[PDB]
């Protein structure tokens, strides 16, 4: 019984990790605290100017942060309760067995 979260903003990811792990801890017991998986960075290097000024670029990255959380003893008073949560917009959740 597992959940993994994804986001471009770690402040939203790290927050909704705790408010998830806690809610299962509410109707617990056993939850495996949020693990930070390594972040996957997609970089973009761009010529700074619109014309011909090759030796001047500017950088850009895209961080997809990764959190995994495990709930051990289901207790269907969270397999019910979790469905009603408050997850901000910059976050995607995959749930697993």
Which residues of this protein are in contact with another protein, per CB under 8 A? 6-9, 42-48, 50, 55-64, 88-92
- Residue 22 interacts with which of RNA, another protein, none, CB < 5 to 8 Å by class: none
Residue with tokens 């008073």: 77
Rg (CA), the chain: 19
**How big is the site for RNA, counted in residues (CB under 7 A)?**
35
75 with 6: CB under 8 angstroms? no
Neighbouring-strand partners of residue 2: 70, 96
Return residues touching RNA (CB under 7 A).
Answer: 4, 10-11, 13-14, 32-43, 45, 48-53, 55-59, 63, 65-66, 68, 70, 94
């Amino acid at each position: 019984i597992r959940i993994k979260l994804r986001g471009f903003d770690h402040k939203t990811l790290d927050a909704s990790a705790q408010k998830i792990v806690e809610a299962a801890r509410r109707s617990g017991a056993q939850v495996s605290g949020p693990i930070p998986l390594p972040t996957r960075v997609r970089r973009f290097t761009v010529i700074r100017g619109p014309f011909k000024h090759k030796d001047s670029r500017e950088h850009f990255e895209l961080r997809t942060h990764n959190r995994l959380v495990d709930i051990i003893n289901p207790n269907r008073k969270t397999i019910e309760q979790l469905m009603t949560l408050d997850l901000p917009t910059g976050v995607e959740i995959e749930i697993k067995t």
